[PDB]
RNA sequence: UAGUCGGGUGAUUAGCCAGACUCUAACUUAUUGAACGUA
């Protein structure tokens, strides 16, 4: 979500971990850390990013830089951005059947 | 609301009582009736109405008797449609009117 | 005809006895007792399980021109009938039709002259059909007295100038007996539930202590786990005292949930904070229902709704879970690990014995110990569009 | 006339009522005269509303079969209209025939013309409508070794060869849609299959597991409790007459039961009643 | 076949040879249709320069991929997905061990 | 004033309105508004006065627009009999339409 | 096993004998209308 938000507009901020539910109930530290590591090919290669939440900050700068690169390059000229998507059981929903005209 | 519903739309079913609030919690009867008489001119000096509501699980469906009020409201609606006629102006104003402040 | 109804009722016909009740002493002490003992008699067999003298359970369904089917017949086994097929055949349409037929039972036990669910003139009639109307005929059974209770939920297609009345009057009559006899003296009513795929939903965050709130949103598909949590908090508040049928209801639901669902071992309510939330001992760790997984949560939101609806709808039954009813489940394998899939029904139909479970599935491993008489099977080639296994 | 009827209610043996429309006397006589003037073709299998052949014969037509099936036409009488009658006549001046034969249950629907159960001429027209229906159904049945009868809203089939009646239901529907367009329709809810493992019975007469007609254990016990009461004279006037009528019915359908009842107590007792 | 029929713009799909709508579609047919068409739309929109936009990149996560799916369909979901999305990274959780039979052990 | 949970299965508020023992829903609406105002002020002042024997003796400025809103005259004639006695050291700035409350206030404070 | 057919005892119940089991009963509507009786 940080990568995604930082592409819509400069300095975006993706979602963060919940405080009530996302932290281990028996954790001796009372905070949860989620340390991801992407590879952007060979040009920029390693890209760390760590989210955190207490019951502690989050180092999200590399994602901000990479998404800023994507955003400025796209603004200057059209490119092919990535496709980040999650599908959970919540995709199991009744067909609403109610179309809406959102005007583009 | 029944007068309004029937003057607006033919067969309109105005607001009904509620099985959850508009029935005395301690009543051997197990139904609530809201009867009311109206007077409209020399002719039809007594237009009755009853809004009835029985709890869930009662043998007789204690039922509103709104036929005469509906008949008068339908007279209003029909004679208005045929020729324009001034109509009643029902309104309600509770303590909720103390609130801050489409051509069709 | 007091004489002919008298003869019928003396034979054992429940409908005639109730009609005699509606004429004599009601503007009698004998026919009221007959009608009430008809719907209240039973015996404890060798297994310690209460068994009705007259069992209420669906017997036949006939889908004429209904969605995919153009004609079909299922002899619902009286007790357990798993319709095993695979997507595209109609195992959900069958439960949808059955729930909409039971909706009239529910509506007319809620109130005489009530109204139940209705087939749709846009999505319930076969598109290839020439009739342009669908007919869910059905027949229930409630003992020697009312051996046949027909119903027919019929609906014509939108735009066709030929309605199709529905024959729900026998349902009105039987539900009238249930409701009136319940009012005069307390009886145990039948439980009706529909747990389709909609019971899987996020754990987002009426009085709930009645007996007729057991029917609220009962044949919609999701149940009401919101109502169960509310009612269980209510029970906890009403039964702390020293630390009473409220206590017994609470214990019954606790044991039911902790027995049907293997991951969940305990469940209680805490308000040491200002929240008043339910704690579940899932996998040996105390958590909240939000923290539960998608298959530990529906496996709870089914059994909890059932136990709730069956403790506060069978008040006089020693073990309310042994009451009667007709419960439809649209995909018993939803979110369940295969090991769980292999013992769902064996335990589901062990604490709710006298309930007719009309279950559906597509996982052949759910039918582990299920007898072949209980399995209805649409052949993959001879698809569901033909009048078992 | 079509509107010359009187409507009323008669109760049901369990719950609810049924609505009947008995014609007027003048049109009653006119339709009787019309029935006498022209006799309508009728099939033998239609063992109902004809001279001699009663319920006993219709039930005995299936006595010597082990597998029984039958279906009930949905809304038999009220479905028949002028179109059905005239199509039947054509397949093998006329406005007054429409007037005499039919009933108008709605004050506005001049064209909503149907037969009523009350009409004395209703049975004849009902039998006439299905003359080719019975022809073809019975021809097919006897081609597959099936005995078929019809007691006026009870189409009964029976056979000894297993797994043959299964195709019969569908057959019926098809033929119906060929004959009476799509107006008269079957009642899929009532269609019943039975064997020598269940409680077969045709038109109220039970068929026991020995290929003989019977009153059923239910009645054989009911009107013998009634007889045991008459033994001590605990009945009433109407109740005694009811017992007499039921004993007469049992004599007609199952004479052996009457003989066994006589042997049970005496002969004079049943002569008295 | 999927198409749009005009005056309310219904989405019609030839399911098992019969033209039904998304309402007249099973709970697994419609859910898989959703999880596929959503990605198709997203990638068509985010890859406007590729001649085959389905070849674009990204990360796609699917929890309980076998949801509302019978065993035969479980056996070929991921393979078709990878065939229409060659380059997308797929992180797929599940609990039914009959989708694994059509993948290399490297990815388990 | 108490909260009755551990009876009735719900949490209800109960008061002794006029010597009764009723639920706060039976209280007059104006009494409810005045109750909410008083409780809010007391909570705020006990939060902001931790080192104090009686936190209600803390300082501050409280403004009240139409202190007699929705209150029956019999309640207006008693509203301000206890504002100062329980909140001595706080400056009250009130506005009002009613003379009945004025029959309890000195001209010095008007 | 279960349902079912219905031979006697006892008195619409209970209860003793037989038996048979196509995937597979569910006893109906009166004054018309047949059929039974009765007069
Ligand atoms: N009105 C209809 N007309 C024609 N076909 C229909 C209609 N409704 C449903 N179908 C059929 O239903 C099929 C889907 O199966 P259905 O939803 O009825 O039950 P299921 O798939 O076995 O169980 P579930 O929906 O829970 O997965 C569609 O392929 C479609 O062919
Ligand atoms: Mg999941």
What does the block give as tokens for E19? Answer: 């033209």
Query: For D217, left (φ over 0), alpha (ψ -120 to 50), or beta?
Result: alpha
Q: How far is CA C248 from CA C51, C255, C312, D136, in A?
A: 21, 11, 11, 67
Q: Interface partners of C (3+ CB pairs, < 8 Å)?
A: A, B, D, E, F
Sheet holding F22-23, edge to edge: F2-3, F13-15, F22-23
Residue D239 marked as a ligand binder:
no
Residue C286 exposed, middle or buried by CB count within 10 Å (0-12, 13-18, 19+): middle
Tell how strand C355-361 and strand C325-329 pair up. Answer: parallel
Atom of ligand 1 nearest to the CA of C384: 22
- CA atoms of C83 and D244, how far apart (whole Å): 53
Residue B41 backbone class (left: φ over 0; alpha: ψ -120 to 50; beta: rest): left
Quick check: helix, strand or coil at residue C86? coil
User: Which ligand lies nearest the alpha carbon of C337?
Assistant: 2
Which conformational region is residue A98 in: left (phi greater than 0), alpha (psi within -120 to 50 degrees), or beta? beta
Q: Which residue has the tokens 């039961």?
A: D257
CA distance E56 to chain C (A): 31
D102 C-beta neighbours (distance < 10 Å), count? 25
**Cβ neighbours of residue D29 closer than 8 Å, sequence gap 6 or more:** none
Q: What angle do CA C218, C220, C226 make, to 5 degrees?
A: 65
Looking only at the bridges linking them, the beta strands covering C277-282 and C264-270 are antiparallel
In angstroms, rounded to a whole number, what is the distance separating the alpha carbons of residues C286 and E89?
35
Asked if D143 CB < 7 A from strand G, the reply is no
Bridge partners of C42, per DSSP, are: C52
CA distance D113 to D175: 24
Q: Tell me if there are at least 3 CB pairs under 8 Å linking chains B and C.
A: yes
| Cβ-based contacts (< 7 Å) between D 206-225 and strand G | 206-210, 214-218, 220-222, 224-225
What does the alpha-carbon distance between residue D76 and residue D94 come to, in Å, rounded to a whole number?
24
Dihedral sign for Cα C16, C19, C21, C25, please: negative
What number of other Cβ atoms are within 10 A of residue B104's Cβ? 2
Residue E18: strand pairing partners: E15
- CA torsion F44-F45-F50-F54 (nearest 10°) is -140
Note the ligand closest to the C-alpha atom of C155.
1
Q: Is A48 on the interface with E (CB under 8 A)?
A: no
Ligand 1 contacts CB of residue C89 (under 6 A): yes
In whole angstroms, what is the distance from residue C157 CA to residue A39 CA?
57
Virtual CA dihedral for A35, A40, A45, A49, nearest 10 degrees?
Answer: -20
Q: Which residues of chain E have a CB within 8 Å of the CB of C331? A: 27, 68
Q: Do C334 and C341 touch, CB atoms closer than 8 A?
A: no
Whether the beta carbon of D242 falls within 7 A of nucleic chain G: the reply is no
**C30, containing H or E segment:** helix C29-38
Handedness of CA C135, C139, C140, C146 (dihedral sign): positive
What is the rounded end-to-end Cα distance, in angstroms, of chain B? 22
**Distance between CA B9 and CA C106 in Å, rounded?**
31
Compute the Cα dihedral for C203, C209, C211, C216 and give only its sign: negative
| Beta-bridge partner residues of B35 | B50
Q: Does D44 show up as a binding residue in the annotation?
A: no
Other beta carbons less than 10 A from residue A29's beta carbon: 11
Computed from CA positions of residues D242, D243, D244, D245, in that sequence, does the dihedral angle turn out positive or negative? Answer: positive
Largest CA distance in chain C: 68
List of residues 6+ apart from F50 with CB closer than 8 A: none
E49 to chain A, closest Cα gap in Å: 7
- Cβ atoms C166, C152 nearer than 8 A: yes
Give the span between the Cα atoms of A79 and E48, in whole angstroms. Answer: 8
Per-residue CA distances from D149 to B87, C344, D126, D156, D197 (Å): 68, 50, 15, 5, 22
Distance CA D182, CA D175 (A): 11
Q: Which residues contact A79 (CB under 8 A, 6 or more apart)?
A: A70, A73, E49
Helix (H, G, I), strand (E, B) or coil at C171: helix
Torsional class of F19: left (φ above 0), alpha (ψ -120 to 50), beta (otherwise): left
| Residue-wise DSSP of A74-100 | HHHS------EEEE-GGG---------
Q: Which residues pair with C111 in a beta bridge?
A: B58
Q: Which strand G nucleotides have any atom less than 7 A from protein CB atoms?
A: 2-13, 19-37
**DSSP, residue by residue, E24-63:** TS-TTHHHHHHHHHHHHHHHHHH-SS-SSGGG---EEEES
Return phi, psi of residue C89, to 5°: -100, -40
What are the Cα distances from residue F38, in Å, to A5, F29, F65, F87, F98? Answer: 46, 14, 14, 10, 20
Residue whose CB lies within 8 A of the most ligand 1 atoms, among C93, C128, C129, C383, for a mutation test: C93
Annotate F33-97 with DSSP letters as a single string: HHHHHHHHHHHHHHHS--S-SSGGG---EEEEESTTTT--HHHHTTGGGSHHHHSTTSEEEEE-S
**Residue D248 backbone phi and psi in degrees, to 5:** -65, -45
Residue E20 belongs to what H/E stretch? strand E18-21
Give the torsion through C-alpha atoms of C370, C375, C378, C384, to 10 deg. Answer: -140
Ligand 1 pocket, C87 CB below 6 A? yes
H or E element that contains C302: helix C294-311
Q: CA D2 from chain center: how many Å?
A: 25
d(CA D45, CA D137): 10
Judge whether D72 is annotated as a binding position: yes
CA gap A74, A90 in Å, rounded? 32
Of A86, A22, A85, A81, nearest to A54 (Cα)? Answer: A22
Q: What is the CA radius of gyration of chain B?
A: 17
Q: How many CB pairs under 8 A join C and E?
A: 50
Dig out the tokens for B30 from the structure: 């197990």
* C74, C82, C87, C194: residue to mutate for ligand 1 pocket, most atoms within 8 A of CB: C87
Nearest to C183 among B20, B57, B61 (CB): B57
At C372 the three-state DSSP class reads: helix
Report the distance separating Cα E64 and Cα E62, nearest Å.
7
Strand G reaches within 7 A of the C79 CB: no
**Distance between CA atoms of residues C319 and E28, nearest Å:** 38
Residue D66, CA: closest nucleotide via C1'? G22
CB D189 within 8 A of CB C152: yes
Q: Phi and psi (nearest 5°) for D7?
A: -100, 150
Resolution attained, angstroms: 2.5
Q: Where are the beta strands (DSSP E) in D147-194?
A: 147-150, 155-159, 185-194
Tokens of C75: 């002899």
Q: Would strands C355-361 and C80-84 be described as parallel, antiparallel, or unpaired? A: parallel
Does the distance separating the beta carbons of F6 and C241 come in below 8 Å?
yes
Instruction: For ligand 1, atom 17, name the residue with the nearest CA.
Output: E26
Residue D134, both tokens: 């019975």
Closest nucleotide over all strands to D164 (CA to C1'): G22
Reading the block at residue C212, the tokens are 């007729």
Residues of C in contact with F5 (CB under 8 A): 237
Q: Classify residue A43 as exposed, middle or buried by CB count within 10 Å of its CB (0-12, 13-18, 19+).
A: exposed
By C-alpha distance, which of D223, D260, D198 is closest to D66?
D198
Which residues does residue D56 pair with via DSSP β-bridges, in sequence order? none
The pairs formed by F27-32 with CB atoms below 8 angstroms and a separation of 24 or more are F28/F70, F28/F71, F28/F72, F28/F75, F29/B95, F29/F70, F30/F68, F30/F69, F30/F70, F30/F71, F30/F72, F30/F75, F31/F71, F31/F75
Tokens of D57: 């014969």
Reference F64, options F80, F46, F85; nearest CA is F80
Residue in C13, C152, C167 closest to D14 by CB: C13
Which nucleotide has the shortest C1'-to-CA distance from C139? G26
Using CA atoms, how far residue F29 sits from D238, F71, F75, F98, in Å, is 72, 8, 12, 17
Distance CA(F27)–CA(F15), nearest Å, equals 9
Per the structure block, which two tokens stand in for C298? 């529906």
Pocket test for ligand 1, best of E11, E13, E20 (most atoms within 8 A of CB): E20
- C-beta C333 within 6 A of ligand 1: no
Max Cα separation, chain D?
64
Q: Which has the closest alpha carbon to A20: A55, A50, A57, A51?
A: A55
Q: At what angle do helices D82-91 and D122-129 cross, to 10 degrees?
A: 50
| 8 A C-beta contact, residue C119 and residue C153 | yes
**Residue located via tokens 């021109």:** C65
d(CA B40, CA B7): 15
Q: Under 8 Å CB-to-CB from A73, ≥6 apart: which residues?
A: A79
Å from CA of B76 to ligand 1 middle: 49
**Residue whose CA is at the smallest distance from ligand 1 atom 13:** C88
Exposure of C167 by Cβ count < 10 A (0-12 exposed, 13-18 middle, 19+ buried)? middle
Q: In F14-39, which positions are buried (b, 16+ CB within 10 angstroms) versus exposed (e)? A: bbeeeeeeeeeeebeebbebbbeeee
């Amino acid at each position: 979500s940080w990568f995604v938000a930082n592409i819509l507009k400069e300095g975006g901020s993706g979602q963060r971990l919940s405080e009530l539910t996302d932290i281990k109930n028996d954790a001796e530290n009372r905070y949860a850390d989620v340390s991801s590591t992407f590879f952007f090919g060979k040009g920029l290669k390693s890209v760390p990013i760590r989210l955190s939440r207490s019951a502690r900050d989050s180092e999200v700068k590399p994602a901000r830089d990479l998404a800023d690169i994507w955003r400025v390059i796209n603004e200057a000229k059209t490119i092919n951005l990535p496709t980040f998507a999650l599908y959970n059981v919540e995709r199991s929903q009744p067909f609403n059947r109610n179309t809406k005209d959102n005007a583009g | 609301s029944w007068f309004v519903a029937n003057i607006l739309k033919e067969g309109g079913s105005g607001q009904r009582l509620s099985e959850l609030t508009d029935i005395k919690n301690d009543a051997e009867n197990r139904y609530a009736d809201v009867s009311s008489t109206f007077f409209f001119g020399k002719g039809l000096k007594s237009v009755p109405i009853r809004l009835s509501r029985s709890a869930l699980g009662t043998a007789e469906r204690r039922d509103s008797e709104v036929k005469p009020a509906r008949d008068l409201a339908d007279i209003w609606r029909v004679i208005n449609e045929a020729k324009t006629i001034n109509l009643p102006t029902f309104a309600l104003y509770n303590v909720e009117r103390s609130q801050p402040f489409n051509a069709g | 005809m007091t004489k002919q109804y008298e003869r019928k009722a003396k034979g054992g016909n429940l409908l005639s006895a109730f009609e005699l009740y509606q004429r004599n002493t009601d503007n009698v002490d004998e026919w009221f007792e007959t009608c009430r003992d008809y719907i209240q008699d039973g015996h404890v067999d060798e297994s310690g399980t209460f068994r009705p003298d007259n069992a209420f359970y669906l017997r036949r369904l006939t889908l004429k021109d209904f969605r995919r089917f153009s004609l079909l017949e299922i002899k619902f086994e009286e007790d357990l009938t798993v319709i095993i097929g695979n997507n595209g055949k109609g195992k959900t349409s069958i439960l949808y039709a059955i729930a909409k037929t039971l909706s009239w039972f529910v509506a007319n036990i809620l109130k005489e002259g009530g109204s139940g669910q209705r087939l749709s003139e846009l999505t319930d009639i076969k598109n290839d059909a020439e009739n342009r109307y669908a007919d869910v005929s059905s027949t229930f059974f409630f003992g020697k007295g009312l051996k046949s209770v027909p119903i027919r939920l019929s609906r014509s297609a939108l735009g066709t100038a030929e309605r199709r009345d529905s024959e729900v009057k026998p349902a009105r009559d039987l539900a009238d007996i249930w409701r009136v006899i319940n009012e005069a003296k307390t009886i145990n009513l039948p439980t009706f539930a529909l747990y389709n795929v909609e019971r899987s939903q996020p754990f987002n965050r009426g009085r709930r202590e009645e007996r007729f709130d057991a029917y609220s949103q009962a044949l919609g598909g999701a149940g009401r786990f919101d109502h169960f949590v509310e009612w269980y908090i209510y029970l906890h508040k009403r039964t702390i005292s020293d630390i009473v049928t409220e206590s017994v209801q609470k214990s019954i639901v606790e044991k039911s949930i902790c027995s049907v669902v293997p991951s969940i071992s305990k469940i209680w309510v805490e308000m040491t904070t200002g929240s008043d939330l339910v704690k579940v001992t899932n996998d040996g760790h105390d958590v909240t229902i939000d923290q539960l997984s998608d298959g530990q949560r529906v496996f709870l939101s089914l059994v909890a709704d059932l136990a709730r609806r069956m403790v506060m709808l069978n008040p006089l039954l020693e073990n309310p879970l042994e009451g009667r009813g007709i419960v439809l489940i649209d995909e018993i394998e939803l979110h369940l690990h295969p090991k769980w899939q292999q013992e769902v029904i064996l335990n589901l139909r062990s604490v709710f014995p006298n309930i007719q479970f009309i279950i559906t599935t597509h996982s052949p491993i759910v039918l582990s110990t299920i007898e072949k008489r209980c399995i209805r099977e649409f052949d993959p080639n001879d698809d569901g569009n033909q009048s078992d296994s | 006339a079509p509107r010359k009827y009187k409507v009323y209610k008669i109760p049901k043996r369990t719950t609810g009522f049924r609505v009947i429309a008995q014609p007027a006397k003048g049109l009653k006589d006119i339709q009787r005269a019309f029935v006498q003037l022209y006799n309508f073709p009728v099939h033998d299998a239609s063992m109902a509303y004809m001279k001699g052949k009663g319920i006993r014969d219709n039930a005995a037509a299936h006595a010597g079969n082990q597998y029984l099936l039958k279906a009930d036409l949905e809304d038999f009488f009220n479905s028949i209209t002028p179109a059905i009658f005239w199509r039947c006549i054509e397949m093998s001046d006329k406005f007054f025939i429409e007037k005499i034969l039919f009933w108008q249950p709605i004050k506005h629907r001049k064209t909503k013309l149907i037969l009523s159960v009350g009409a004395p001429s209703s049975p004849v027209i009902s039998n006439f409508c299905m003359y080719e229906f019975d022809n073809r159904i019975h021809a097919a049945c006897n081609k597959l070794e099936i005995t078929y009868t019809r007691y006026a809203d009870d189409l009964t089939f029976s056979c000894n060869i297993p797994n043959v009646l299964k195709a019969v239901p569908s057959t019926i529907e098809a033929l119906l849609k060929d004959l009476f367009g799509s107006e008269l329709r079957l009642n899929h809810s009532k269609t019943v299959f039975s064997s020598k493992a269940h409680n077969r019975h045709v038109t109220g007469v039970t068929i026991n597991n020995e290929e003989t007609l019977s009153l059923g254990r239910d009645r054989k016990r009911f009107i013998k409790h009634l007889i045991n009461q008459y033994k001590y004279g605990l009945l009433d006037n109407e109740d005694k007459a009811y017992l007499t009528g039921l004993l007469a019915f049992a004599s007609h359908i199952e004479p052996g039961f009457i003989t066994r009842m006589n042997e049970k107590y005496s002969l004079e007792l049943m002569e008295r009643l």
